[PDB]
Design an enzyme around this catalytic site. Structure first.
Site, PDB file in Angstrom:
ATOM      1  N   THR D 134       0.804  -1.210   0.000  1.00 22.27           N
ATOM      2  CA  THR D 134       0.000   0.000   0.000  1.00 22.27           C
ATOM      3  C   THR D 134       0.838   1.261   0.000  1.00 22.27           C
ATOM      4  O   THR D 134       0.291   2.347   0.188  1.00 22.27           O
ATOM      5  CB  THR D 134      -0.921   0.024   1.210  1.00 22.27           C
ATOM      6  OG1 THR D 134      -1.638   1.262   1.233  1.00 22.27           O
ATOM      7  CG2 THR D 134      -0.114  -0.100   2.460  1.00 22.27           C
ATOM      8  N   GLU D 243       9.426  24.493 -14.761  1.00 22.66           N
ATOM      9  CA  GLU D 243      10.857  24.610 -15.001  1.00 22.66           C
ATOM     10  C   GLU D 243      11.652  23.422 -14.487  1.00 22.66           C
ATOM     11  O   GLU D 243      12.809  23.258 -14.878  1.00 22.66           O
ATOM     12  CB  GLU D 243      11.395  25.882 -14.350  1.00 22.66           C
ATOM     13  CG  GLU D 243      10.878  27.166 -14.978  1.00 22.66           C
ATOM     14  CD  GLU D 243      11.065  28.373 -14.084  1.00 22.66           C
ATOM     15  OE1 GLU D 243      11.069  28.199 -12.851  1.00 22.66           O
ATOM     16  OE2 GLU D 243      11.203  29.496 -14.616  1.00 22.66           O
TER      17      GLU D 243
HETATM   18  N1  LIG Z   1      10.164   8.804   7.231  1.00 27.74           N
HETATM   19  C1  LIG Z   1       9.530   7.823   7.862  1.00 27.74           C
HETATM   20  N2  LIG Z   1       9.672   6.538   7.387  1.00 27.74           N
HETATM   21  C2  LIG Z   1       9.044   5.518   8.007  1.00 27.74           C
HETATM   22  C3  LIG Z   1       8.254   5.754   9.117  1.00 27.74           C
HETATM   23  N3  LIG Z   1       7.759   4.569   9.513  1.00 27.74           N
HETATM   24  C4  LIG Z   1       8.217   3.608   8.685  1.00 27.74           C
HETATM   25  N4  LIG Z   1       9.017   4.178   7.749  1.00 27.74           N
HETATM   26  C5  LIG Z   1       9.728   3.504   6.650  1.00 27.74           C
HETATM   27  O1  LIG Z   1       8.875   2.646   5.924  1.00 27.74           O
HETATM   28  C6  LIG Z   1       9.591   1.499   5.515  1.00 27.74           C
HETATM   29  C7  LIG Z   1       8.638   0.339   5.295  1.00 27.74           C
HETATM   30  O2  LIG Z   1       7.396   0.916   4.989  1.00 27.74           O
HETATM   31  P1  LIG Z   1       6.787   0.764   3.522  1.00 27.74           P
HETATM   32  O3  LIG Z   1       7.732  -0.033   2.671  1.00 27.74           O
HETATM   33  O4  LIG Z   1       6.581   2.142   2.967  1.00 27.74           O
HETATM   34  O5  LIG Z   1       5.412  -0.030   3.746  1.00 27.74           O
HETATM   35  P2  LIG Z   1       4.023   0.735   3.961  1.00 27.74           P
HETATM   36  O6  LIG Z   1       3.776   1.820   2.955  1.00 27.74           O
HETATM   37  O7  LIG Z   1       4.004   1.276   5.360  1.00 27.74           O
HETATM   38  O8  LIG Z   1       2.897  -0.387   3.801  1.00 27.74           O
HETATM   39  P3  LIG Z   1       2.193  -0.979   5.112  1.00 27.74           P
HETATM   40  O9  LIG Z   1       3.233  -1.430   6.104  1.00 27.74           O
HETATM   41  O10 LIG Z   1       1.330  -2.142   4.703  1.00 27.74           O
HETATM   42  O11 LIG Z   1       1.337   0.095   5.734  1.00 27.74           O
HETATM   43  C8  LIG Z   1      10.589   1.244   6.622  1.00 27.74           C
HETATM   44  O12 LIG Z   1      11.776   0.709   6.094  1.00 27.74           O
HETATM   45  C9  LIG Z   1      10.836   2.622   7.202  1.00 27.74           C
HETATM   46  O13 LIG Z   1      12.091   3.107   6.784  1.00 27.74           O
HETATM   47  C10 LIG Z   1       8.108   7.044   9.601  1.00 27.74           C
HETATM   48  O14 LIG Z   1       7.408   7.262  10.577  1.00 27.74           O
HETATM   49  N5  LIG Z   1       8.746   8.086   8.972  1.00 27.74           N
END
Ligand SMILES: Nc1nc2c(ncn2[C@@H]2O[C@H](COP(=O)(O)OP(=O)(O)OP(=O)(O)O)[C@@H](O)[C@H]2O)c(=O)[nH]1
Ligand SMILES: Nc1nc2c(ncn2[C@@H]2O[C@H](COP(=O)(O)OP(=O)(O)O)[C@@H](O)[C@H]2O)c(=O)[nH]1
Ligand SMILES: Nc1nc2c(ncn2[C@@H]2O[C@H](COP(=O)(O)OP(=O)(O)O)[C@@H](O)[C@H]2O)c(=O)[nH]1
Ligand SMILES: [Mg+2]
Lengths: 426, 44, 152, 429, 370
Positions: D134, D243
């Protein structure tokens, strides 16, 4: 000066109209013990449209409240506004109405002349002027299609010139209460054609639907269901009652909307409807009210307006408003949607303006519509008639009180001939 | 032609019902009490 | 004999009344189970000193005689419009530090009767008072004296 | 009135969106409830409220529900906060095929309702990552359904790049290489961040041991506010949003640039030593301050876009740009002798209250399209090769509709992307 | 939005699921007569996952007790239950609760793999639920006999559930004697410790954490191939009455005791083991560079012993809500090669079922090999 007479009858009409004499109460600022409290003197100069006078500044409504039971007049007096209504015009019946239109219409046909006719002529002659006659009956009950709908052919026999305006409650099959609704509602729409020029249609599934899709409240009672009609009924006379820009009245709404003497079955609407959580996030302006106005989900008679072309379409407006864009989006919606209007009639939209917005609003736009898909309401209630008539199943309640089989066949023999006019001019 | 809907608008199908503290279907619109406020009748 | 507080029944507003539910001892988890997503983020739109150098260097005083190596700005070189259409003061070499310098009472008194202005003694005392009121720190300046004499 | 739509999709984009709309609200006089005692991001209703332009769509219930009960609940339209039923479980065929297909009719109207309200719209600000069912699969649903409708418009996505050495997902590289399969067709500026470098930026400059996630949402928050300052604040040298598709991308599949922000500093080091214009841009190029895990010394810079901010003077900028481009260390590409690009504005670097930063007068944001990120694509298909050989973890992606007919079709397309850092890197004669 | 149907089947599963409901009820603030206590607003937000309510503040679980039952109701929290589904029919009650449910995801069945009620009736009833809801996850917590009946039982179960948890009482006993200095192992203490290990992984389903991973995501992450699904639990910050004031509490400290060999639930050998997938679920208010750095540092200390030909051999999860009392806690769960020894002993202890067990042992062997 153009006083309006409202005839409330039935278990329906004394609980639908019991909300109708509440928005007339606050838009004129009427206390529930008779006297007016307010500051703005715009709304007591035309107080006489709905409120007669007495001594001590007290204002009682011109009202008729009749039933064949004593049932519902122990409830309308039991509301918050029960002291406002007049003491003598509750006209009683010690017996019961009892679901049938046979008891009220012919057995209690000779009773209503002493009951309602002698209170109306006592009242309606006593006004310094008159405008018309407006009754709200349930088609599917015993008093509304009993006592009330015979009176629709009784006062109209006395005064032919005036205007009949029936907010009529036609039932729907999905939300149902009684199994013999082809036996009290089919037996009254034959009488409505000759004797009621402006004939609205209110449903009970589309009204819950509006409080599901739009206002998002999950368990709607009848009281929330009856202000979507009580705003409509007060919101159509907004130019007979207040100043403004382009005033209209109940002849000026009938010339535009009735092209033919039998093509006169309208259907209602009400524009500014938005939910309980997103109040401030929507900007109530002109192009959003007219986008709420025209779609299928907003319209109060449970029909899809896309299957049938509108012959004619009316409106009304309120609030401090600029005319230009009001008259402009109704130039577009006739032009872009040429498929959903007929040809052969040049104009199809009427607009009228007031000055005061309603209580707690800024704008409002009540909708009145003559479409040729009201035959969808009148094919389903004849689809079930003769599919029940062939077993004659519930006939043995109707040959025992004074009507024949032979008037039963004629009430549907002209019901199709109504639909045979809407179908031809489609 | 049908027009789009969100989650849990009609409730023509029969659902179990919770108190609105529990974050369930159609929680927010019944959490917020409907609000109105007026001052007086305006002028023309 | 009852408490004066009886709560509403839900997070929905204007519910029918109900009593306050009792939280039993050693079962209060509000002080310990706080959240961590939006609870660390509380920036309300309803304070600290400033670190670095200014690009104009007006905070440091200006040196009297400049070295050749000085390329650090001080603001005394005005705009190119003020070099291409100078005031007559700039045309012959008197400038804004000579305006803003602290002169003496006898210096302003010698200025008065020799610049072509005949002034009463009480008017001169009032002009000095109005100039010291116009200046935030409070002294005698050419710009302040001319501005107070022009306004009053 | 150069507006953009700011969706926050997936979990890894919405806590930043918590911190994104903090920083926009505190910048102006807008309160959390939206009453001002801005026109790029905010729609205003005449009662006294302001409403941001942000739709918070995710399948996960609690992270949207923590906002509707949160302290920013009186900000958004509460029909924009869109939730489905069940999470996508980091499965591409669950966030794009079986549960994500249920919610696309609603969000086609919601980007249409906002854009009919906007006047001079200039594109989009989606916030996603590269690992999510997602978060990475589902952003390629909200992308191809817009270019068929909106088409030519400037799309800026901030996507957490999968780090070289750390990660937390497991079946990640199966659909990251599927994310790029269509976002090559329809993305025009897809900015990327590794969080692993920001883990160590805090450890060297910021006097920080044990940093949370709440600190990294603020530093990602500034970069979005650095690129969007030229819409809400007029400057000496503006850079607008059409741009960015002629400055940056030289060939239509080289549109993946880095980001950093130089004077990240605490309150005890910034007091001691000054900050000119000729040293905050020297601090941009040093290998201990880029926010993405990379070593730039093996990479030739293609086109920097230095975004300055605050109290700067344009001769101080061009004095500094010629000191740096004469340096024998940092290498460039020969067929771009132009190289750089400046942006100077009169609005300072903001500060969040209760934060760790200091009140610095000047702050810069260099946004460098570089060479060196190609060797970080050497590892992202090397990781893909090993799982896919033994058909490991495929038994679930085939559960919800996807087959084997696309997994090799994507690998060659990420093989062909690694080649296009060699036709252009090998110099003509 | 995830949902759960909990069934106690067989005796040992009955008494462990009783402690399960007691643990979740104390973590959610319900008086055992059923009334809600609302000290914090996070307690009732996702009570819909495991419960349905009643009129007047009463709550009642989504649990069926099928097989003792008078002893359970006579116990600590018996009064919460529905007295109409104490079946001893099961099809009717499972469609009743699963039809009153909205969107279903998973099932918590407590049984064993060593007896005449937890094994045969367990396999029958998992068949009878997988034939009804083929799109859910059956978390079926199980007890297997000590390597110092199951072959009949497991060979439909390994097809069906894939979420069983099978190491047992010998490891529980040695944990109690060594790392707790706990003199008298009562049965209730082991029920307590297994029940807390149940409740450790049910906070991403009930609370908003930080890295939110539900059960289907856990299935996709952990299980590579559709027959390698028997997992290894363990609960980290356990110590005695004395050693608390001598130990400290940090993420590097709980990493030590979640990868402590004497702490895990196993009478097994990680020195002969190789973890395909690890998940460490943390609860508390903890910084996350500590989490990720300590994750890959303890993976860096052992290149051989975590599995080769997998880059990330570990996974972390974290929630914002700790247990009762303890400021932070950890629960480690693994999928190793250190588990086929139990299969070898239980196979050296119908014939096609034995052949399928030999197939599963050879499956571990041919996937551990290069
Ligand atoms: N910048 C930031 N990154 C985050 C945070 N929480 C998790 N992440 C990053 O998200 C990564 C994994 O999340 P995704 O691959 O995007 O998965 P997702 O979009 O959360 O999908 P779901 O887990 O099913 O909700 C991790 O490796 C983290 O680095 C946060 O609070 N802030
Ligand atoms: N939606 C709605 N329906 C009403 C209301 N009052 C009456 N009805 C309908 O009217 C029908 C009952 O007719 P009834 O009032 O008993 O007939 P009467 O005895 O002649 O007045 C039922 O189908 C009801 O659904 C109302 O306030 N709202
Ligand atoms: N927690 C707990 N576990 C028990 C108790 N009694 C037995 N057990 C476990 O139950 C297992 C054997 O039971 P089982 O084979 O399932 O027989 P069954 O219950 O009749 O099916 C033993 O290995 C014990 O570990 C008890 O009182 N409490
Ligand atoms: Mg999630």
């Amino acid at each position: 000066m153009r006083e309006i007479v409202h005839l409330q009858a039935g278990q329906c009409g004394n609980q639908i109209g019991a909300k109708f004499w509440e928005v007339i109460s606050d838009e004129h600022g009427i206390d529930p013990t008779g006297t007016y409290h307010g500051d703005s003197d715009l709304q007591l100069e035309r107080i006489n449209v709905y409120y007669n006078e007495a001594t001590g500044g007290k204002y009682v409504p011109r009202a008729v409240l009749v039933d064949l039971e004593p049932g519902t007049m122990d409830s309308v007096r039991s509301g918050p506004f029960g002291q406002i209504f007049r003491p003598d015009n509750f006209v009683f019946g010690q017996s019961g109405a009892g679901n049938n239109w046979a008891k009220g219409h012919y057995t209690e046909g000779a009773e209503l002349v002493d009951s309602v006719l002698d209170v109306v002529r006592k009242e309606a002659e006593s006004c310094d002027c008159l405008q018309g006659f407006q009754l709200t009956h349930s088609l599917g009950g015993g008093t509304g299609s009993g006592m009330g709908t015979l009176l629709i052919s009784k006062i109209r026999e006395e005064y032919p010139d005036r205007i009949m305006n029936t907010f009529s409650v036609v039932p729907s099959p999905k939300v149902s209460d009684t199994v013999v609704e082809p036996y009290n509602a089919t037996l009254s729409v034959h009488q409505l054609v000759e004797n009621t020029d402006e004939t609205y249609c209110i449903d009970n599934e589309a009204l819950y639907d509006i409080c599901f899709r739009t206002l998002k409240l999950t368990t709607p009672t009848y009281g929330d269901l009856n202000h979507l009609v009580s705003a409509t009924m007060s919101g159509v006379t907004t130019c007979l009652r207040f100043p403004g820009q382009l005033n209209a009245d109940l002849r000026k709404l009938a010339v535009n909307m009735v092209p033919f003497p039998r093509l006169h079955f309208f259907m209602p609407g009400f524009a500014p409807l938005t939910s309980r959580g997103s109040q401030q996030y929507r900007a109530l302006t002109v192009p959003e009210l007219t986008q709420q106005m025209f779609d299928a989900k907003n319209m109060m008679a449970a029909c899809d307006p896309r299957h049938g072309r509108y012959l004619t379409v009316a409106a009304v407006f309120r609030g401090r408003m600029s005319m230009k864009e009001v008259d402009e989006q109704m130039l577009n919606v006739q032009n872009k949607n040429s498929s959903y209007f007929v040809e052969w009639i040049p104009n199809n939209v009427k607009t009228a303006v007031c000055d005061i917005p309603p209580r707690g609003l800024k704008m409002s736009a009540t909708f009145i519509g003559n479409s040729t898909a009201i035959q969808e309401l009148f094919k389903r209630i004849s689809e079930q008639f003769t599919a029940m008539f062939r077993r004659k199943a519930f006939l043995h309640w109707y040959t025992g009180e004074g009507m024949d089989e032979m008037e039963f066949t004629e009430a549907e023999s002209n019901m199709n001939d109504l639909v045979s006019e809407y179908q031809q001019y489609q | 032609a049908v027009s789009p809907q969100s989650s849990s608008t009609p409730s023509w199908k029969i659902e179990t019902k919770y108190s609105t503290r529990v974050l369930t279907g159609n929680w927010t619109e019944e959490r917020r009490k409907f609000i109105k406020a007026t001052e007086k009748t305006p002028q023309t | 004999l009852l408490k004066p507080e009886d709560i509403v029944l839900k997070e929905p507003g204007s519910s029918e009344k109900t009593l306050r539910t009792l939280l039993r001892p050693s079962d209060k988890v509000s002080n310990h189970y706080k959240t961590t997503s939006s609870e660390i983020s509380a920036v309300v739109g309803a304070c600290y000193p400033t670190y670095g150098v200014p690009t104009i260097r007006s905070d440091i005083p200006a040196p009297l005689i400049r070295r050749v190596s000085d390329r650090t700005s001080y603001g005394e070189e005005g705009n190119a419009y003020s070099l291409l259409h100078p005031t007559i003061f700039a045309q012959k070499g008197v400038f804004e530090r000579d305006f803003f310098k602290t002169r003496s009472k006898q210096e302003i008194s010698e200025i008065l009767c020799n610049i072509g202005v005949k002034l009463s003694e009480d008017e001169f005392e009032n002009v000095w008072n109005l100039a010291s009121k116009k200046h935030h720190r409070g002294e005698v300046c050419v710009e302040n004296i001319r501005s107070v004499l022009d306004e009053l | 009135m150069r507006e953009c739509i700011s969706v926050h999709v997936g979990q890894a984009g919405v806590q930043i969106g918590n911190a994104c709309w903090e920083l926009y609200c505190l910048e102006h006089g807008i309160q959390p409830d939206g009453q001002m005692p801005f026109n790029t991001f905010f729609s205003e209703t005449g009662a006294g409220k302001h409403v941001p332009r942000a739709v918070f769509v995710d399948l996960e219930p609690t992270v949207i529900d923590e906002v509707r009960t949160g302290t920013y609940r009186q900000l958004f339209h509460p029909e924009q906060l869109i939730t489905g039923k069940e999470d996508a479980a980091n499965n591409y065929a669950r966030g794009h095929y079986t549960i994500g297909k249920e919610l696309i009719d609603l969000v086609l109207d919601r980007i249409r309702k906002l854009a009919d309200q906007c006047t001079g719209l200039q594109g989009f600000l989606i916030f996603h990552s590269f690992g999510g069912g997602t978060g990475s699969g589902f952003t390629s649903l909200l992308m191809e359904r817009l270019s068929v409708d909106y088409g030519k418009k400037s799309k800026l996505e901030f996507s957490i790049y999968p780090a070289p050495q750390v990660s937390t997902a497991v079946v990640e590289p199966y659909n990251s290489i599927l994310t790029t399969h269509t976002t090559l067709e329809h993305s025009d500026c897809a900015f990327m961040v590794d969080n692993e470098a920001i883990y160590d930026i805090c450890r060297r400059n910021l006097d920080i041991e044990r940093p949370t996630y709440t600190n990294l949402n603020r530093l990602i928050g500034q970069i979005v506010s650095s690129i969007t300052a030229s819409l809400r604040f007029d400057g000496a040298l503006n850079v607008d949003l059409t741009e960015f598709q002629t400055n940056l991308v030289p060939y239509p599949r080289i549109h993946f640039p880095l980001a950093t922000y130089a004077p990240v500093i605490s309150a005890e080091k910034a007091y001691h030593e000054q900050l000119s214009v000729a040293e905050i841009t020297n601090a941009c190029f040093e290998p201990a301050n880029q926010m993405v895990k990379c070593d730039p010394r093996h990479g030739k810079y293609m086109a920097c876009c230095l975004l300055y901010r605050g109290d700067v003077v344009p001769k101080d900028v061009n004095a500094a740009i010629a000191t740096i481009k004469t340096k024998r260390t940092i290498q460039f590409v020969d067929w771009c002798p132009t190289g750089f690009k400046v942006g100077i504005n009169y609005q300072p670097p903001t500060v969040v209250p209760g934060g760790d930063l200091a009140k610095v007068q000047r702050a810069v944001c260099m946004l460098s399209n570089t060479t060196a990120i190609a060797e970080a694509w050497a590892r992202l298909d090397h990781k893909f090769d090993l799982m896919y050989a033994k058909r490991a973890f495929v038994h679930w992606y085939v559960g919800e509709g996807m087959e084997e007919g696309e997994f090799s079709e994507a690998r060659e397309d990420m093989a062909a992307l690694e080649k296009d850092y060699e036709e252009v890197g090998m110099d003509s004669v």
